[PDB]
């Protein structure tokens, strides 16, 4: 009596950026089945004999690209029971990627499926044998008794002991602080503060790498050529062009030096002179020396970012925001519209008092009452009283965020900034109108009003640029990096440390983690590190990541839920008569209106999945894996905030739903909404300037005269210089691209991720609901009454929360995870 099995795997070279299939035969790969129902004398499931792959199975039609299938037969007599797990031992010298095992039975119901999706190195490298479980879901108390120890031992394998340098083939999840970003052993000027583990610099934890201390600072971790992630977080890709995450490394270590050399050799003018010089980047391109182009175009990923003639030309793609109107970005209407439908749509707040007030210490900064007067504003005939009472006043407030850093920034050689406020008025036609900008300095502090003619219209244009320099920095460092990438990683770590792969909540959440540790590790190495891409292109330079620590002090997990966010920002009110429980004070608000549809669908899914496994509130309390998971995520992963009173306790069904819903929301729709618009809106540097280099010119200076005679040059002298523009355009093009192997909301990588047909059916309903939401959002973008805020003068429909997308730079599609 034998059991027929099929093993599907991919050899190593299919997923890299030579293999031989017959080498897998012979005695080179062993599997041993493990009983779920018959135990040995110590209560452990009985283990069968070593069994080797017999032959190649080419007669299998369900195979995907790069996959190979092998037949196997298992001798399994009547003493052995029913198999529920297996061990595998790879005796080859090379690792392979194990997809699945499927055992055949007389009936289709008796098929047993194992979904593995795991790299398997040579067995001498591992401390304990690699084990895999069948696809049945179990809360711990429901685990078959012969599998209990194994389930617990594998969780111990994933946690390690807190020590040691991590090597490529390790699968060990643990926490550390952000002490790996500085490079003091290269130069003292590259020292950076440790972020995390203090009340001065609180921060989420990141994945532990264990490379040990620098020579000059025992607090900082020494450099490495590879920044470890647990092996099965280091994703391979069938197509080299899909390894976008690796492009950030190539950009920093190969492309940026090549660009810098072109500027050092005066082979191209160092500054833009006119707005046409910027538009040229996507029309005729920029001309560079042949050795720079020959440095750039052989590189995977990087070569996809540009068109070239192979000799002198690099062209950038035309950004969405200039596809219909080259100039509409300059309009006040677009400036305000992008606050509710642009790259960073989640900062604007309602104003219930006037004037707005500061929360900083007057002993250090001064009177910080706004200098905006009520009677200087044109509110289309409303008094201030009426506008406040009707909730038609809003603001973009960067005053208290930036004021503590402006002095230090303004002492950097390549930066000058204001701390800004923007007052907006909601017209009767439903669009926002900017009515005043306040530009403040600590320790002059000016109010600028709109103006279409004269030198004052140029001053207004520059005031908008300083606002958007604030907003670009806040978007990249806080809305994007802190609130999604950095805040999510500790939950990834805790999940693998404490929820068995068997666990229903592991299965629910882990699709929403795909590639997140991997892109984050590459970002610590090349994006957010000292002298990295963010420091050399965004305003705060060496203060960039530490500013995000100051903002994390006020981060609140439960305020990341979309309805809570909208209430807290005063852009909606609670209203149980509405379908979503909130009424939007800006009715057409596209990010919020579309987001509420997606939020509701995810909520329905979580609410239909959890009660499959947790019938009563007690069942949540009694799940030891779930309780250890949430205790560790809060008290280690976000441990600098562990004292705060707003953390859910996780003692009820409602808590479990809330926590799962918020995590899925951050990782999918929130990240998509702030990420995939970066090149579409920001690929024109004038529209989203990353830095400012001077303050407003004083009257009677040649800089003031220039401002009168050549507004374009005055604008370009103020914002990001040409060389950092090239670098930042390249990085946000990468970050805005969907890889062809992306897994979107409503999709999963394997359709047999669980054997529970009820869960499978609830998941199908979720995917159907998303397709109907997409149709609803299409209709909104076609509704002429919503054109003012959904399309605007740039005539660009808001598609960033359409759930589906094709590959590429599409301005749509919601991935499952923080994948790029
Ligand atoms: Fe991202």
UniProtKB/Swiss-Prot annotation:
Result of changing residue 678 to N/E: Reduces catalytic activity
Q: Where is the stretch described as Disordered?
A: 201-223
Entry superkingdom? Eukaryota
| Catalytic reaction(s) noted | (9Z,12Z)-octadecadienoate + O2 = (13S)-hydroperoxy-(9Z,11E)-octadecadienoate; (9Z,12Z,15Z)-octadecatrienoate + O2 = (13S)-hydroperoxy-(9Z,11E,15Z)-octadecatrienoate; (4Z,7Z,10Z,13Z,16Z,19Z)-docosahexaenoate + O2 = (17S)-hydroperoxy-(4Z,7Z,10Z,13Z,15E,19Z)-docosahexaenoate; (4Z,7Z,10Z,13Z,16Z)-docosapentaenoate + O2 = (17S)-hydroperoxy-(4Z,7Z,10Z,13Z,15E)-docosapentaenoate
TM helices/strands, residue ranges: none
* Entry's induction text: The hydroperoxide product serves to activate the resting enzyme. The activation is accompanied by the oxidation of Fe(2+)entadiene structure.
Effect annotated for changing residue 523 to T/V: Complete loss of activity
Question: Which leading EC class covers this enzyme?
Answer: oxidoreductase
Coiled-coil residues are none
Q: Where is the Lipoxygenase domain?
A: 137-820
Q: Could you tell me which InterPro entries the record lists for this protein? A: LipOase (IPR000907), LipOase_C (IPR013819), LipOase_C_sf (IPR036226), LipOase_CS (IPR020834), LipOase_Fe_BS (IPR020833), LipOase_plant (IPR001246), Lipoxy_PLAT/LH2 (IPR042057), Lipoxygenase_dom_3 (IPR027433)
Its GO biological process terms? fatty acid biosynthetic process; fatty acid oxidation; lipid oxidation; oxylipin biosynthetic process
Got a GO cellular component term for this one?
Answer: cytoplasm
Q: One MF term from GO for this chain?
A: iron ion binding
Keyword tags? Cytoplasm, Dioxygenase, Fatty acid biosynthesis, Fatty acid metabolism, Iron, Lipid biosynthesis, Lipid metabolism, Metal-binding, Oxidoreductase, Oxylipin biosynthesis
Q: Which residues form the PLAT domain?
A: 11-134
Q: Which cofactor does it need?
A: Fe cation
Q: Which Pfam families match?
A: Lipoxygenase (PF00305), PLAT (PF01477)
State the pH dependence. Answer: Inactive below pH 6.0.
Q: What does altering residue 735 to A do?
A: Reduces catalytic efficiency more than 14000-fold
- Result of mutating residue 475 to S? 8% of wild-type activity
What EC numbers are recorded for this enzyme? 1.13.11.12
Entry similarity comment: Belongs to the lipoxygenase family.
Function recorded in the entry: Plant lipoxygenase may be involved in a number of diverse aspects of plant physiology including growth and development, pest resistance, and senescence or responses to wounding. At pH above 8.5, only (9Z,11E,13S)-13-hydroperoxyoctadeca-9,11-dienoate is produced, but as the pH decreases, the proportion of (9S)-hydroperoxide increases linearly until at pH 6.0 it represents about 25 % of the products.
- The protein, known as: Seed linoleate 13S-lipoxygenase-1
Specify the species.
Glycine max
Chain's gene name: LOX1.1
């Amino acid at each position: 009596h034998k059991i027929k099995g099929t093993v599907v795997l991919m050899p190593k070279n299919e997923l890299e950026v030579v293999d031989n299939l017959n080498a897998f035969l012979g005695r080179s790969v062993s599997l041993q089945l493990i009983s779920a129902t018959k135990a040995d004398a110590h209560g452990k499931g009985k283990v069968g004999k070593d069994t080797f792959l017999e032959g190649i199975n080419t007669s299998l039609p369900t195979l995907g690209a790069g996959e190979s299938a092998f037949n196997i037969h298992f001798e399994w007599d009547g003493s052995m029971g029913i198999p529920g797990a297996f061990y595998i031992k790879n005796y080859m010298q090379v690792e392979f990627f194990l997809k699945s095992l499927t055992l055949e039975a007389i009936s289709n119901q008796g098929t047993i499926r194992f979904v593995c999706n795991s790299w398997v190195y040579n067995t001498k490298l591992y401390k304990s044998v690699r084990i895999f479980f069948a696809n049945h879901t179990y809360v711990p108390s429901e685990t078959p008794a012969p599998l209990v120890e194994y389930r617990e031992e594998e969780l111990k394998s994933l946690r390690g002991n807190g020590t040691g340098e991590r090597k490529e083939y390790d699968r060990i999840y643990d926490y550390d602080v952000y002490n790996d970003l500085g490079n003091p052993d290269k130069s003292e000027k590259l020292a950076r503060p440790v972020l995390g583990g203090s009340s001065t610099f609180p921060y989420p934890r990141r994945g532990r790498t264990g490379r040990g201390p620098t020579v000059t600072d025992p607090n900082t971790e020494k450099q490495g050529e590879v920044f470890y992630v647990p092996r099965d977080e280091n994703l391979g890709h069938l197509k080299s062009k899909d390894a976008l995450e690796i492009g950030t490394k190539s950009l920093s270590q190969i492309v940026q030096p090549a660009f810098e050399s072109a500027f050092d050799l005066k082979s191209t003018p160092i500054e833009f002179h006119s707005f046409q010089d910027v538009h040229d980047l996507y029309e005729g391109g920029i001309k560079l020396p042949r050795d720079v182009i020959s440095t750039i175009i052989p590189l995977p990923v990087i070569k996809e970012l540009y068109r070239t003639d192979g000799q002198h030309i690099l062209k950038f793609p035309q950004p969405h925001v200039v596809q219909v109107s080259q100039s509409a970005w300059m309009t006040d209407e677009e400036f305000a519209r992008e606050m509710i439908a642009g790259v960073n749509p989640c900062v604007i707040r309602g104003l219930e008092e006037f004037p707005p007030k500061s929360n900083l210490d007057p002993a250090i900064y001064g009177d910080q009452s706004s200098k905006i007067t009520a009677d200087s504003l044109d509110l289309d005939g409303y008094t201030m009283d009426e506008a406040l009472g009707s909730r038609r006043l809003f603001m973009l407030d960067y005053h208290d965020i930036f004021m503590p850093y402006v002095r230090q920034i303004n002492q950097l050689n390549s930066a000058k900034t204001y701390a800004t406020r923007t007052i907006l008025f909601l017209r009767e036609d439903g669009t926002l109108k900017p009515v005043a900008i306040e530009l403040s300095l600590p320790h002059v502090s000016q109010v600028v009003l709109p103006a279409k003619e004269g030198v004052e219209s140029t001053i207004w244009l520059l005031a908008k640029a300083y606002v958007i320099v604030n907003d670009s920095c806040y978007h990249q460092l806080m809305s994007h990096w802190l609130n999604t990438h950095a805040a999510m990683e500790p939950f990834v770590i805790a999940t693998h440390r404490h929820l068995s792969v068997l666990h229903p909540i592991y299965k629910l959440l882990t699709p929403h983690y795909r590639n997140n540790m991997n892109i984050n590790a590459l970002a610590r190495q090349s994006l957010i590190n000292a002298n990295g891409i963010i420091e050399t292109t965004f305003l705060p330079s060496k203060y960039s990541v530490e500013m995000s620590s100051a903002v994390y002090k006020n981060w609140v997990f439960t305020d990341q839920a979309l309805p809570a966010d909208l209430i807290k920002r005063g852009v909606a009110i609670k209203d149980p008569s509405t379908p979503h429980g909130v009424r939007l004070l800006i009715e057409d608000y596209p990010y919020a209106a579309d987001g509420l549809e997606i939020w509701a669908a995810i909520k329905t899914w979580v609410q239909e999945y959890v009660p499959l496994y947790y019938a009563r509130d007690d069942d949540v309390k009694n799940d030891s894996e779930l309780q250890h998971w949430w205790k560790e995520a809060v008290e280690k992963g976000h441990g600098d905030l562990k004292d705060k009173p707003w953390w859910p306790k996780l003692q009820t069904l409602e808590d479990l739903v809330e926590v799962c819903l918020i995590i899925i929301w951050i990782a999918s729709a929130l990240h998509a909404a702030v990420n995939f618009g970066q090149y579409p809106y920001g690929g024109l540097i004038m529209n989203r300037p990353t830095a400012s280099r001077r303050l407003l010119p004083e009257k009677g200076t040649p800089e003031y005269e220039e401002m009168i005679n050549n507004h374009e040059k005055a604008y370009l002298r103020t914002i990001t210089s040409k060389l950092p523009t090239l670098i930042s355009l390249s990085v946000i093009e990468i970050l805005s691209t969907h890889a062809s192997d992306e897994v979107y909301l409503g999709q999963r990588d394997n359709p047999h991720w669980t054997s529970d047909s009820k869960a499978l059916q609830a998941f199908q309903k979720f995917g159907n609901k998303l397709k109907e939401i997409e149709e609803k959002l299409v209709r909104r973008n076609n509704d002429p009454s919503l054109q003012g805020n959904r399309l605007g003068p740039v005539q660009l429909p808001y598609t960033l929360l359409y759930p589906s997308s094709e590959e590429g730079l599409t301005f749509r599609g919601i991935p499952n995870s923080i994948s790029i």
